[PDB]
Structure 1
């Protein structure tokens, strides 16, 4: 027996296991599908970034009805440290109203102010050098960045010169410098904080900051390369799990917990454990012959991600060096790698293909002449039109509440809906942070080795195309501003200056948008049960005792930001919630 068993050793699972094992009377077993990383350069060194080393194999979407019925490979981590081990290290909090909105959906104790102590606890910020801060326009508010917590973050110690042209261009088209994008608003441009340990300029992933750091503890146990295949119950009490080798060896083992089972298996993993365990929609469980322990139609509903668009460019006068110099100039690449190996300086401190600065914008900043028109269309349309026909009414009610919160965010000048980035080379990136579309993740069988059916339903809500087209147009403004025109950019096929109407631009976007940046969330949502929720405000699964969801399956909806910083902080908070209930 262990005190706690955690299914998934990703960001949430390892953060929780670390904090729970601070009490030597508490024992934890973390069961993780993937192996330990080997500290290979493709993980530790930003410039060597090789995320495909630990992608979960054999996951494909359904044909995407909103994206010309395209099928895409599904990307999620399978490795100790989860997404933190293979992500692009972008470390950003959401905006105040994200957390305040989660609270307003019926979740006492959720707000920006309740999260801020956990953001601070989570991390240690290391300031950049003064000369890079001054030259780069790096700013921060030290009063709201942690100085003593486990997650290291800082910045690269270098910037490609064309990042300057893009900064000035973004300013020219109404994206001003943001003092600190961690202070609960991020309207304009800023340096991307990176989850790097500045001692060695290497990745600070959860395997290091929430396992290696505390791995002398005998009460903190890890079992890599095993899958949690089922939750075990005595009546409605979660008492243990079954696990199998990830490789599918014909062996099953049962292990038991004296206090709780925690699911931390991610947006695409947690709902599958619940559904195989008979916690999920009666209709699906009945079809597969799985006994219903708790009839929760929200399990596998409400899937969200943050779609991405790569816009290709050619330049008549780009500045050298730039990120594509690493790929197209072997001499430059070898000299920057030798520079990093010697004094830990230069381009290898930046995640490969990224630049150092980024822009975020509200709907009114993206669409200053038309945002009210997009809000009017969204307010006019029935919430239920966004969901499959015959969606459970409780799930529709939760989606209606989310939608009302997001339409308030659309009117809010201080909440982001999209991002613009330029890596300094042949492509730009435009992310959609706040889709109104909702997808599904459902098991197809009782075989725990079978991939679930993953249907992002990207672009099924027509409002999303209007928001995304506005983001595309703002990106075009940056590239046509004086500071960027000096580099001689032009959109490459299948984009181009001759695509001038919304219709022309979005027909190409429909063919190129990726449903996912591997930010899958919200498939075991924290909302009232009568709003299609799966977990309470204490993250307890409805209808059963001793069972919580820790991973970002529990989020109601996506942030103005990428998920990692909040995945850590929310696990920091859940550790304290659990310790208080037991008296640990």
Structure 2
């Protein structure tokens, strides 16, 4: 037997396995669906970014009722290190009120102040060079960035010149410099912290910082290329798991843990393990003939992501070099790759297609003249209208609680609802951080090789379109500001300056929005059981003993920011919770 078995070797699972195996008396088995990465350039080198190397195959959404019934390919990692292995390395904490709100939903021990020690413990920040900090407007507060923890993060050591135009344009339209976006607020523009190891200017993914770093430990066991297919019980006690080869060989193996089973299989994986195991909504489990171990209607409910919109541009006077120089100028690309190979300088330190700066804004910063109209519309509408009729009443109660918390965030000048980015080339990105829409992820069969049904339900809550239209208009203001006008941008079809009304703009958005930036969360939510929760404040699955959820399935709702930094810090926190319960060193 092992002390602990962890299902999924992504950010959360490897962070937890690392910390638990600090005690040589504790043995851990991590079972991971994907393989070990091969250290290929597309993983290690930011400018060679090739995320598609390790996407989970064969996942498609249902037709999206709020997006003209489009079906989309679903993106999530299948690799040791999970999303950290293949993500764009953007390393950002949420805002204070995200964590405070999670506590106020009925979760003792959750707040910004309780998470800050774990953010610090998780990481080592390496400052940029002084010349780059001064030239680039890079600032930080060293008092709230960790100096001793495993996750290395820093910045690229270069910026494209057009990023200066965009910074100044953003400041011209009311997005000022942010001292430190890791300090719990991020209203304006800042350099993107990047999960890069500055010694080699390579990706610091969880495979490296929470497995390779400690891989001499005989008590830290990994089994790549295998799927956890079921949790095994003795009564209501979780005692082990069944696993199969990911590749579909007709073989099943049982393995047992003396203390606990931890699920770390991600927003789209954890609810499937639970449902196949009889932990889930009795209606679904009964329809598939699965015996009910714990009747939890929240499992696979409450799916959230952070939608994205790519706006195309043409320019009369764009500045050289820019990110698109790497794809259209073989001489520039070769010279930048030679520069990286020699002295680790230049464009290849930036994740391909990204720039170095970004902006985040509250609803009142996006829409100073109309945010109170959006809040009124959202306040007037019953929470229940965002969910199908016959949604479990407990799940509706938890959604109403989340919705009330998010409407307080809409009123708050210090909480973000949207992100704007320009990579310096032919497109800008606008991200909707705080959707009120909620989706589902449900098994369709008892076959553990069958994809679940994934329905994002993007844009089903009509408030989302009002927020997202306001974010689009703020992006347009940046591109129309003096410092950007000198590059001669214009929106290209299917957008364009000739789309002036909300109706005109949103009809194109409805056709172009991507439901997902692979930020899937919240499908095994940490809320009281009577609010449709799946886990307690200690991340224990209701109705069973010895079973926790570590991956971002547990989150109640999306952050003002992208998930990775909090995925690491939440696993650091949970490792201490588990150590305390079991008296571990």
Q: Which residue of 1 aligns with 2:515?
A: 515
Output the CA distance in 1 between the equivalents of 2:171 and 2:569: 31
1:175-231 per-position Cα deviation (integer Å, ceiling 9, x unaligned): 000000000000000000000000000000000000000000000000000000000
1:79-113 per-position Cα deviation (integer Å, ceiling 9, x unaligned): 00000000000000000000000000000000000
Output the CA distance in 1 between the equivalents of 2:247 and 2:128: 43
Residues 261-410 of structure 1: pairs in structure 2 closer than 5 A: 261-410=261-410
Output the CA distance in 2 between the equivalents of 1:574 and 1:583: 14
Query: How much has 1:320 moved relative to structure 2?
Result: 0.2
Output the CA distance in 1 between the equivalents of 2:548 and 2:430: 35
1:466-516 per-position Cα deviation (integer Å, ceiling 9, x unaligned): 000000000000000000000000000000000000000000000000000
1:356-381 per-position Cα deviation (integer Å, ceiling 9, x unaligned): 00000000000000000000000000
Q: Which residue of 2 aligns with 1:227?
A: 227
Query: How much has 1:388 moved relative to structure 2?
Result: 1.2
1:422-447 per-position Cα deviation (integer Å, ceiling 9, x unaligned): 00000000000000000000000000
Q: Which residue of 1 aligns with 2:52?
A: 52
Output the CA distance in 2 between the equivalents of 1:84 and 1:33: 15
Query: How much has 1:385 moved relative to structure 2?
Result: 0.1
Query: How much has 1:283 moved relative to structure 2?
Result: 0.2
Q: Secondary structure at the match of 2:541?
A: coil
Q: Secondary structure at the match of 1:420?
A: strand
Query: How much has 1:12 moved relative to structure 2?
Result: 0.1
Query: How much has 1:536 moved relative to structure 2?
Result: 0.2
Output the CA distance in 1 between the equivalents of 2:201 and 2:128: 12
Q: Which residue of 2 aligns with 1:107?
A: 107
1:18-71 per-position Cα deviation (integer Å, ceiling 9, x unaligned): 000000000000000000000000000000000000000000000000000000
Q: Secondary structure at the match of 1:67?
A: coil
Q: Secondary structure at the match of 1:323?
A: coil
Q: Which residue of 2 aligns with 1:128?
A: 128
Q: Which residue of 2 aligns with 1:187?
A: 187
Q: Which residue of 1 aligns with 2:440?
A: 440
Q: Secondary structure at the match of 1:556?
A: coil
Q: Secondary structure at the match of 1:430?
A: strand
Q: Secondary structure at the match of 2:437?
A: coil
Compute the TM-score of the two structures, normalised by the length of structure 1: 1.00
1:281-324 per-position Cα deviation (integer Å, ceiling 9, x unaligned): 00000000000000000000000000000000000000000000
Query: How much has 1:5 moved relative to structure 2?
Result: 0.1
Output the CA distance in 1 between the equivalents of 2:60 and 2:325: 33
Output the CA distance in 2 between the equivalents of 1:142 and 1:248: 49
Q: Secondary structure at the match of 1:321?
A: coil
Output the CA distance in 2 between the equivalents of 1:433 and 1:330: 36
Output the CA distance in 1 between the equivalents of 2:505 and 2:327: 29
Count of residues paired in the alignment = 584
Flag structure 2 segments of 5+ consecutive residues without an equivalent. none
Query: How much has 1:355 moved relative to structure 2?
Result: 0.2
Q: Secondary structure at the match of 2:259?
A: strand
Q: Which residue of 2 aligns with 1:497?
A: 497
Output the CA distance in 1 between the equivalents of 2:357 and 2:40: 27
Output the CA distance in 2 between the equivalents of 1:53 and 1:449: 20
Output the CA distance in 2 between the equivalents of 1:133 and 1:203: 21
Output the CA distance in 2 between the equivalents of 1:427 and 1:17: 40
1:235-260 per-position Cα deviation (integer Å, ceiling 9, x unaligned): 00000000000001010000000000
Query: How much has 1:135 moved relative to structure 2?
Result: 0.2
Output the CA distance in 2 between the equivalents of 1:212 and 1:576: 21
Q: Secondary structure at the match of 1:287?
A: helix
Output the CA distance in 1 between the equivalents of 2:118 and 2:32: 25
Q: Secondary structure at the match of 1:131?
A: helix
Output the CA distance in 2 between the equivalents of 1:437 and 1:334: 45
Output the CA distance in 1 between the equivalents of 2:506 and 2:435: 15
1:250-273 per-position Cα deviation (integer Å, ceiling 9, x unaligned): 100000000000000000000000
Query: How much has 1:389 moved relative to structure 2?
Result: 1.3
Output the CA distance in 2 between the equivalents of 1:407 and 1:328: 45
Compute the TM-score of the two structures, normalised by the length of structure 2: 1.00
Output the CA distance in 2 between the equivalents of 1:451 and 1:331: 44
Residues 530-569 of structure 1: pairs in structure 2 closer than 5 A: 530-569=530-569
Query: How much has 1:418 moved relative to structure 2?
Result: 0.1
Output the CA distance in 1 between the equivalents of 2:331 and 2:52: 25
CA RMSD, Structure 1 to Structure 2 (Å): 0.2
Query: How much has 1:330 moved relative to structure 2?
Result: 0.7
